[PDB]
Design an enzyme around this catalytic site. Structure first.
Site, PDB file in Angstrom:
ATOM      1  N   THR A   1     -16.933 120.767  18.807  1.00 52.53           N
ATOM      2  CA  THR A   1     -18.182 120.066  19.107  1.00 52.53           C
ATOM      3  C   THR A   1     -17.957 118.608  18.726  1.00 52.53           C
ATOM      4  OG1 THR A   1     -19.553 121.988  18.789  1.00 52.53           O
ATOM      5  CG2 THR A   1     -20.625 119.845  18.496  1.00 52.53           C
ATOM      6  N   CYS A   2     -17.311 118.413  17.584  1.00 51.99           N
ATOM      7  CA  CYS A   2     -17.054 117.019  17.134  1.00 51.99           C
ATOM      8  C   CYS A   2     -16.205 116.248  18.140  1.00 51.99           C
ATOM      9  CB  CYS A   2     -16.300 117.044  15.793  1.00 51.99           C
ATOM     10  SG  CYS A   2     -17.209 117.924  14.462  1.00 51.99           S
ATOM     11  N   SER A   3     -15.182 116.911  18.683  1.00 50.12           N
ATOM     12  CA  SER A   3     -14.153 116.255  19.482  1.00 50.12           C
ATOM     13  C   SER A   3     -14.506 116.059  20.961  1.00 50.12           C
ATOM     14  CB  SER A   3     -12.826 116.994  19.387  1.00 50.12           C
ATOM     15  OG  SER A   3     -12.408 117.047  18.054  1.00 50.12           O
TER      16      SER A   3
END
Length: 162
Positions: A50-52
């Site tokens: 999700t971060c990336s």
């Protein structure tokens, strides 16, 4: 600490990154944020999905819009060391405006009250996902997730209230 909230003063602390000649630097948070309007957004982990794929790309894609609305610096903090954060930054050759900052001992994250227990998931202690708008140390917006979900902490949700 309780989670940092709107109207609070942002605490100082020390964060790490690589400069343009590839040397390790460590500077204070106030040395990057005092006297100006900035965004500080927190992610649970470099290289995680999700971060990336969602959270960081949103900031790169909206950087232009955000800077035209007064934002002078866009800072991404994670509980990862600066070696990992350097490799992660290199995965975004397109990025000219997001600075990747390392809090790999979770010190600054606990000063914000934003620690998250990811022991069972295999990441140890990390930060909650969040986005803050901070104007000369005063928190103007605080969009803080429960854990690592992605519901309130996007670039789009900081943009809409600028």
């Amino acid at each position: 600490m309780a989670p940092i909230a709107v109207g609070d003063v942002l605490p100082d602390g020390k964060l790490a990154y690589f400069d343009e000649q590839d040397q390790l630097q460590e500077v204070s948070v106030h040395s990057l944020v005092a006297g100006k309007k900035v965004i500080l957004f927190g992610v649970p982990g470099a290289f995680t999905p999700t971060c990336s794929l969602k959270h960081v790309p949103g900031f790169i894609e909206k950087a232009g819009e955000l800077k035209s609305k007064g934002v002078t610096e866009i800072l991404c903090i994670s509980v990862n060391d600066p070696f990992v954060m350097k490799a992660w930054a290199k995965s975004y050759p397109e990025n000219k405006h997001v600075k990747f900052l390392a809090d790999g001992s979770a010190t600054y994250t606990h000063a914000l009250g934003l620690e998250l227990d990811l022991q069972e998931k295999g990441l140890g202690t990390r930060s909650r996902r969040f986005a803050l708008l901070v104007d000369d140390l005063k928190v103007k917006a605080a969009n803080i997730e429960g854990g690592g979900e992605f519901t309130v902490s996007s670039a789009e949700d900081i943009l809409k209230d600028l």
